[PDB]
Amino acid sequence: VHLTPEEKSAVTALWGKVNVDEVGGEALGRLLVVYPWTQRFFESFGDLSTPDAVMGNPKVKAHGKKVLGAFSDGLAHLDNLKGTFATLSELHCDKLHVDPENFRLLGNVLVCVLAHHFGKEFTPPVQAAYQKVVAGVANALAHKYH
Amino acid sequence: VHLTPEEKSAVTALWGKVNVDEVGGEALGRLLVVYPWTQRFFESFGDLSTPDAVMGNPKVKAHGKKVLGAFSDGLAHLDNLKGTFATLSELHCDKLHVDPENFRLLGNVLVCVLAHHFGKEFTPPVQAAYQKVVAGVANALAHKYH
Amino acid sequence: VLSPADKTNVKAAWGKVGAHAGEYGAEALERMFLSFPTTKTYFPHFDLSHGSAQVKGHGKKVADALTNAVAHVDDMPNALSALSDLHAHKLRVDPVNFKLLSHCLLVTLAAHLPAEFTPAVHASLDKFLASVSTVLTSKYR
Amino acid sequence: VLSPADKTNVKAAWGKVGAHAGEYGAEALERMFLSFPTTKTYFPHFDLSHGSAQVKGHGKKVADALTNAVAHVDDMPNALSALSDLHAHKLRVDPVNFKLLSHCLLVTLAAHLPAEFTPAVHASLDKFLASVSTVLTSKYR
Numbered sequence: 424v425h426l427t428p429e430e431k432s433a434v435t436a437l438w439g440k441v442n443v444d445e446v447g448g449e450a451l452g453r454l455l456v457v458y459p460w461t462q463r464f465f466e467s468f469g470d471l472s473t474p475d476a477v478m479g480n481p482k483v484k485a486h487g488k489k490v491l492g493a494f495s496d497g498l499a500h501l502d503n504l505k506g507t508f509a510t511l512s513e514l515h516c517d518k519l520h521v522d523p524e525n526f527r528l529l530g531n532v533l534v535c536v537l538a539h540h541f542g543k544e545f546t547p548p549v550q551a552a553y554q555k556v557v558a559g560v561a562n563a564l565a566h567k568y569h
Numbered sequence: 570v571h572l573t574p575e576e577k578s579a580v581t582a583l584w585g586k587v588n589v590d591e592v593g594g595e596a597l598g599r600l601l602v603v604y605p606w607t608q609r610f611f612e613s614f615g616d617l618s619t620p621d622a623v624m625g626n627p628k629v630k631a632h633g634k635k636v637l638g639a640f641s642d643g644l645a646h647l648d649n650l651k652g653t654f655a656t657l658s659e660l661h662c663d664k665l666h667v668d669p670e671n672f673r674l675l676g677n678v679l680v681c682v683l684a685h686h687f688g689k690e691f692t693p694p695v696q697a698a699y700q701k702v703v704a705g706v707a708n709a710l711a712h713k714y715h
Numbered sequence: 716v717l718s719p720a721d722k723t724n725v726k727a728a729w730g731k732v733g734a735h736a737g738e739y740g741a742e743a744l745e746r747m748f749l750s751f752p753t754t755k756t757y758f759p760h761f762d763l764s765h766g767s768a769q770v771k772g773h774g775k776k777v778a779d780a781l782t783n784a785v786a787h788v789d790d791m792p793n794a795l796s797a798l799s800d801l802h803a804h805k806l807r808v809d810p811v812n813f814k815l816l817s818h819c820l821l822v823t824l825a826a827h828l829p830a831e832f833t834p835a836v837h838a839s840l841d842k843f844l845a846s847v848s849t850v851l852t853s854k855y856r
Numbered sequence: 857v858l859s860p861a862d863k864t865n866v867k868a869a870w871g872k873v874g875a876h877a878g879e880y881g882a883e884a885l886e887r888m889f890l891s892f893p894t895t896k897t898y899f900p901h902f903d904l905s906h907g908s909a910q911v912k913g914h915g916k917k918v919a920d921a922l923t924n925a926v927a928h929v930d931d932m933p934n935a936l937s938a939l940s941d942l943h944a945h946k947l948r949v950d951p952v953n954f955k956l957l958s959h960c961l962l963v964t965l966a967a968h969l970p971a972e973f974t975p976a977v978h979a980s981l982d983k984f985l986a987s988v989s990t991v992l993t994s995k996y997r
């Protein structure tokens with residue numbers, strides 16, 4: 424993904440401060456509340472009926488951890504997102520049957536959560552770089568769909 | 570863009586039979602009727618108040634043929650869409666200020682028109698190949714946007 | 716909003732289709748699956764090979780719904796209320812896909828009705844399919 | 857459709873924005889121009905540089921219009937009528953761009969309202985912005 428070193432060091436800069444244990448659950452949780460239709464993939468996660476039931480749902484929190492862990496690993500390989508995510512791409516498509524549009528929604532939500540946690544330090548320039556990142560990640564996860 | 574050699578072939582075979590004058594005028598005229606907001610870029614062409622005025626406007630027709638000309642050249646370069654349309658991308662961004670989202674619209678109109686002309690011959694597999702071409706072209710036209 | 720000239724255009728157009736609604740329905744589905752493979756994630760249980768029955772059958776169900784919408788054009792939200800219900804609470808298809816199927820319907824119609832698919836008619840049908848989509852996703856949240 | 861709960865969330869959140877609106881609006885536009893450069897095609901005459909006086913002044917206008925929709929949340933299509941005509945006949949911005957700016961507004965508000973930006977408020981504000989966008993885009997054709 425065409426990313427300047429300016430873009431790259433800033434992205435990496437900020438990520439150092441991220442509590443993956445928290446941001447992952449916030450991001451997955453907000454996805455399920457803001458775009459309620461995406462709940463069609465997580466019925467087995469139990470009760471998701473009110474905002475609190477979703478945000479505090481332990482399976483939602485555990486699962487968001489896994490999501491962000493894999494994301495972190497993508498930030499470690501920004502020059503090979505496609506290869507880094509190929510088996511996850513095959514899985515989401517062949518086993519889980521997830522519409523790739525869903526990766527873009529999560530990307531955008533994640534950006535709002537970032538903003539929420541860092542305030543002023545989430546500058547427009549820093550946002551612009553994170554938008555390129557979530558777009559690259561979303562594209563890499565969709566690439567093996569056929 | 571990843572085109573199959575038989576897809577590359579399906580596209581070339583059909584293009585070989587396109588009447589560029591007719592098809593070009595028809596695609597552009599339809600873009601202007603189906604999506605009236607696109608008219609913002611062609612104020613100088615004249616009266617465009619109605620579908621008939623638009624489809625009969627000789628400058629629209631002449632411009633339709635020129636656009637499809639640039640498109641034809643792109644089919645001779647399917648392995649290098651970016652390089653072929655680099656300067657056309659600079660132009661459409663720096664001097665004309667055209668939002669690339671408009672390229673996708675013209676692409677889809679272009680596909681209905683070919684369907685309209687070739688009928689039974691514009692089969693689902695043939696359509697699938699031309700959908701990739703049109704996206705590829707749209708993406709190359711968008712490349713130098715900054 | 717659909718104008719009177721739009722409603723006329725869509726009844727006329729849909730009128731010819733006539734008995735061929737079911738087939739054009741199936742054809743649009745096939746074009747969508749091959750042109751936009753991500754749409755297939757919503758149909759993991761169907762055989763999607765060319766001309767197979769599941770697709771045949773669903774093609775008619777889609778067409779009937781539209782025929783229904785054409786005959787109830789001044790009252791779409793009410794005539795489609797249960798379908799909207801079903802999309803919002805059970806199917807949950809991302810809204811972007813509706814444009815993809817809409818386009819494939821337009822292509823299918825252009826291919827089968829060369830005389831009727833004028834630019835004014837093209838315009839009306841597009842607005843109509845967009846209005847239908849709006850209705851089907853109105854209760855998502 | 858906005859619900860009673862959404863209206864409440866929206867009024868409370870915009871209430872906390874207050875006299876920072878023109879400023880959040882300008883920040884939203886700046887976020888938009890850097891994250892999605894295609895949007896700059898609609899402002900070729902504006903000096904878009906950070907701190908630009910034209911940009912701040914424009915944020916204010918965007919913000920005031922949002923304030924008027926909050927103030928008339930039960931009569932939005934009519935309170936925004938003049939704005940919807942301007943967009944359809946003059947501005948003619950492509951619908952996809954309204955989502956980009958909405959997203960940037962949400963980011964701007966999350967960046968400034970840590971306590972009010974709960975999952976439920978974010979959900980209502982997102983819905984609200986999608987309805988504003990729909991109104992402003994409703995008379996395009």
Ligand code: HEM
Nearest residue numbers: 461464465467489490493494511519521525526529560564
């Ligand atoms: C940043 C993008 C995403 C990443 C990196 C990601 C990563 C992962 C990982 C690591 C797993 C566990 C894999 C396994 O069980 O073997 C997973 C599972 C799953 N993902 Fe995603 N995911 C993403 C987005 C999405 C979204 C948008 C959806 C649907 C809305 C989704 C739906 C699922 C489902 C349904 C599972 C299995 C749940 C279960 O265990 O029952 N993923 N994802």
Ligand code: HEM
Nearest residue numbers: 607610611613635636639640661665667671672675706710
């Ligand atoms: C398939 C994608 C397109 C291609 C290949 C294409 C190609 C061209 C070409 C060859 C020219 C002539 C440039 C010159 O030598 O002066 C042109 C001009 C122009 N294009 Fe495009 N075009 C495309 C799509 C669009 C669309 C979608 C819009 C807006 C809806 C647009 C807006 C314009 C405008 C405003 C001009 C200048 C017209 C004038 O001279 O008055 N183009 N384009």
Ligand code: HEM
Nearest residue numbers: 754757758776777780781798801806808812813816847848
């Ligand atoms: C023009 C818009 C559409 C209309 C009018 C429409 C109509 C219908 C109808 C009438 C049904 C059967 C409802 C029943 O169970 O009685 C159905 C089912 C279904 N539709 Fe569509 N549909 C539309 C668009 C879409 C799109 C865009 C998708 C996704 C790409 C989609 C995916 C589905 C799925 C997954 C089912 C359930 C099939 C099954 O499991 O048997 N639909 N639709």
Ligand code: HEM
Nearest residue numbers: 895898899917918921922939942947949953954957988989
């Ligand atoms: C939240 C949705 C939006 C609202 C409420 C809004 C509101 C406004 C207002 C009040 C004006 C001043 C018009 C006047 O009265 O003279 C304006 C102008 C304008 N807007 Fe927006 N706008 C929105 C979205 C957009 C977006 C998505 C675009 C394109 C990216 C855009 C581009 C423009 C342009 C080009 C002008 C005219 C600039 C000039 O003065 O030359 N707007 N808008």
